[PDB]
Chain A
């Protein structure tokens, strides 16, 4: 229950998704020393980092491909407006 409502509030549909309840550490030592990170959290972070790097890589490749395309199109323009040698006329040329 409540999956659709949670999505509207910006939360994950399943309470076990991204949120304080799951991601926050489940315990710490009585001394206050932090506990070793949970294996699930470390794995989930690694996937998230991998997802971000793909986002950067794809954006950079597309943007470059756009900029590089412009430069090529410019060259074709200038190449067209090329003149050489001379233009004699008349009964002798």
Chain B
């Protein structure tokens, strides 16, 4: 049992894949939302290390990571233990005023105005 190298074809999407997941092959998203959803117990030690490097020690708690190849390379190692979701900014990036009023939704949207009131 040794580390495996996945064929490059796995990470080359198909036209229907873009339709299903609703992601444009151009203007790719910038930030990942990564959550660990399985345990590192009974997994090889290299998988254990990458999980600690990425900060996913606690399960079901989301961490933000750069959508850059070096980060992606580690994520591919632990692809089976995590869920990757594209961070969305419906109302734009938070500013100094809106830093204290943010909330990350389950949908993947970081809203900058969080009122806890009926939409009305």
Residues on A close to B: CB < 8 A?
7, 10-13, 17-20, 23-24, 45, 48-49, 51-56, 58-59, 62
> Given A20-B116, A62-B30, A62-B68, do A55 and B106 touch, yes or no (CB 8 Å)?
no
Decide if B116 touches A19 in the complex (CB within 8 Å): yes
B51 within 8 A of partner (CB): no
Across the interface, B94 reaches (CB within 8 A) one of A13, A19, A23, A56, namely: A56
In terms of DSSP, what is the predominant structure of the interface of chain B? loop
Contact residues in B for A20 (Cβ distance below 8 Å):
116-117
Q: Which B residues between 48 and 101 are near A, CB-CB below 8 angstroms?
A: 62, 64-66, 68, 87, 93-94, 99-100
Chain A residue with Cβ nearest B117: A20
Decide if B116 touches A11 in the complex (CB within 8 Å): no
Closest 10 CB pairs of A and B: A52-B102, A52-B94, A20-B116, A54-B64, A52-B99, A58-B66, A7-B106, A23-B116, A10-B107, A18-B103
Interface size class of B (residues with CB under 8 A): 20 to 34
Residues on B close to A: CB < 8 A?
30-31, 62, 64-66, 68, 87, 93-94, 99-100, 102-107, 110, 116-117
Decide if B100 touches A45 in the complex (CB within 8 Å): yes
Q: What are 26 pairs between A and B in contact, CB < 8 Å?
A: A7-B106, A10-B105, A10-B106, A10-B107, A11-B106, A13-B106, A18-B103, A18-B105, A19-B116, A20-B117, A23-B116, A24-B116, A45-B100, A48-B104, A49-B100, A51-B102, A52-B94, A52-B102, A52-B110, A55-B87, A55-B94, A55-B110, A58-B64, A58-B65, A59-B31, A62-B68
Contact residues in B for A53 (Cβ distance below 8 Å):
99
Chain B residue with Cβ nearest A19: B116
In whole angstroms, how far apart are the Cα atoms of A11 and B104 in the complex?
Answer: 11
